[PDB]
Amino acid sequence: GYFKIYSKHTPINLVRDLPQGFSALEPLVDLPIGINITRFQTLLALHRS
Amino acid sequence: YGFQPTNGVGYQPYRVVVLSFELLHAPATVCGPKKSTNLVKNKCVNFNF
Ligand SMILES: *[C@@H]1O[C@H](CO)[C@@H](O)[C@H](O)[C@H]1NC(C)=O
Q1: How many CA atoms lie within 13 A of A42 on its CB side?
Q2: Ligand 1 in contact with A49 (CB < 6 A)?
Q3: Is A38 in the pocket of ligand 1 (CB under 6 A)?
Q4: Residue B25 CA: which ligand 1 atom is closest?
Q5: Which of A5, A15, A17, B19 lies in the 20 to 30 Å Cα band around B10?
């Protein structure tokens, strides 16, 4: 019933390709929800201007 | 109820609050309080952190 989220923000010196290296992720959040999960999605900001 | 201020007890309005504690099957939730004591450094004294 806890939804844990770890995260890390590293700066690449590329724009959009997966690099190589080691970087450990530090815990961010903890939510005592109870929710069941089986699926997920993503959200994007369109092109309009 | 036509409540009037000159009503004998037992006809005057009473406000009621019913607290109902329930325990579904989650991981946890609210709970009692927990006071905090002091800290005596340097002395084999029992402790709880
Ligand atoms: C999540 O789904 C399963 C389906 O097998 C169900 O048995 C379970 O009770 C659900 N989780 C909760 C917290 O109810």
Answers
A1: 3
A2: no
A3: no
A4: 13
A5: B19
Method: cryo-EM
CA distance linking residue B1 with residue B13, whole number of Å: 9
Residue A23 beta carbon below 6 angstroms from any ligand 1 atom? no
- The Cα A28–Cα A16 span in angstroms is 24
- SS3 labels along A1-47: CEEEEEECCCCCCCCCCCCCCCCCCEEEEEEECCCCCCCCCCCCCCC
Q: Which residues does residue A7 pair with via DSSP β-bridges, in sequence order? A: A26
| Spacing, Cα A35 to ligand 1 middle (Å) | 9
Q: How many helices (H) and strands (E) does chain B have?
A: 0, 0
